[PDB]
Design a binder for these strands. Sequence first.
DNA 1: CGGATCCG
DNA 2: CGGATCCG
Length: 176
Amino acid sequence: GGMLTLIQGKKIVNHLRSRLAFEYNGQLIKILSKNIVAVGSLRREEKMLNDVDLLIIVPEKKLLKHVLPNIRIKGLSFSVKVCGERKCVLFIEWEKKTYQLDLFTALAEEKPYAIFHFTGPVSYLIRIRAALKKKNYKLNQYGLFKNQTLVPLKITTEKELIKELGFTYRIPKKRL
DNA sequence: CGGATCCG
DNA sequence: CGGATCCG
Ligand SMILES: [Mn+2]
């Protein structure tokens, strides 16, 4: 995959917002734009992008086996590099060039944890998770855990989650 | 099928 | 830090 400018990345994301679907028992089901979240370095507003990352919120657990393994993009030709229920890396054709598109899935209850994780950057997440680890927690893209048991937090949004964990909220571009 | 190498 | 996917 080639490099994208921030503007080029946003044009691709806007194009894909209405064009993602998946096959379920032989029927095409379109993914709702509200269930597609730009994440990764594009969400952090980096000037150049190595790839475009999209998080797909899956409303029902029964569909995880179906969404990414049967993912479809209207119009654009693409190839599958790797694909499973949780991560699918595609090489898409866009204006006569090939780019890397990373798709990730989160279930509804995981959404703020997934937004936090997939926004990154890695260095930011490592220091936050290291701090929680010393207090006997484990943080991942699925939830907050203590002794491998989910700790349910009274939060809905990524912002609420970051503050409930004990950290000041930073806008994505300022996370480092 | 698991060490290697991806993903944030 | 923590997790996902598959080449070999
Ligand atoms: Mn990325």
